[PDB]
Design an enzyme around this catalytic site. Sequence first.
Site, PDB file in Angstrom:
ATOM      1  CG  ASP A   1      97.125  45.006  88.582  1.00  0.00           C
ATOM      2  OD1 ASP A   1      97.648  45.027  88.393  1.00  0.00           O
ATOM      3  OD2 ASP A   1      96.743  43.244  89.184  1.00  0.00           O
TER       4      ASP A   1
ATOM      5  CB  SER B   1     111.430  53.505  78.479  1.00  0.00           C
ATOM      6  OG  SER B   1     111.736  54.414  78.408  1.00  0.00           O
TER       7      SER B   1
END
Length: 330
Positions: free
Chosen positions: A35, A199
Amino acid sequence: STGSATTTPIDSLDDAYITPVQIGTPAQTLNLDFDTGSSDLWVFSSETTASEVDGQTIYTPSKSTTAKLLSGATWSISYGDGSSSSGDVYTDTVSVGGLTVTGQAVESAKKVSSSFTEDSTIDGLLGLAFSTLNTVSPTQQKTFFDNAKASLDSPVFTADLGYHAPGTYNFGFIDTTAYTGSITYTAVSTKQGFWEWTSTGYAVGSGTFKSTSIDGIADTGTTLLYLPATVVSAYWAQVSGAKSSSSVGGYVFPCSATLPSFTFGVGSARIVIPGDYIDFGPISTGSSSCFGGIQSSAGIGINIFGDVALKAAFVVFNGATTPTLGFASK
């Protein structure tokens, strides 16, 4: 040193991936959920409340000659999905794919929430976010990566998740055979303890690319792609009959649909998520309503590039003094 381990989807939907991890001496092999959005290595154990264990493999520290109680240490964690676990702490030897760390904090669960109990395939979590998020008290502990780092050939790990197939986690090297083209690196903020990046935009299907900054985290422990409501509405508007269902808890679509791809930007580069990666199947067994793999991050307070996004790429988690992320097509 290096390590290399195969990661395997737990079910036909890729709801999560498990990676075998050796703990203790002699080795006890547990299948952990790696994770990159958390920083605790915790396991089902001989200490876990018996009624909360249903099929998991447990770690038994009393059977490990290298286990030592970390006296006074406790831990307690709550995840984004509402799940939780807590317990006490041992140090022990932990190996992943041939890479060994001695003295790793192994957080032994005394209590786990119902979602953990109900998932027999996941024996615990191995956190790969920054050690600043580790929950051990009163002495915070380091992640497996942070303890391994100085020994690694390069201070990196890579995630290469499969679509309905096994993939690979590598530590200490970048497998230049595992991706196509070049790796585009992008800046990381560690201020919230995550692999947080920005992004450069998105496209839906064959549509034009929208240049827009989307801050979010690279999180292997989250199944889906969670993005701003504007972006998510623009995606589902291209699917006839898709709608946001407050009763189901997100966007659903007709199981008869063919889904468009979704592209996200990494600098000037582009990662394309095929439409099929966005199908999470019937909302309930036999339903003709299917659950979408792109969902709104509104109310979660962060955008999450979970497995839907990451499995479309070869992803480099660069733990150099200034961390960065890298993405390549594959």
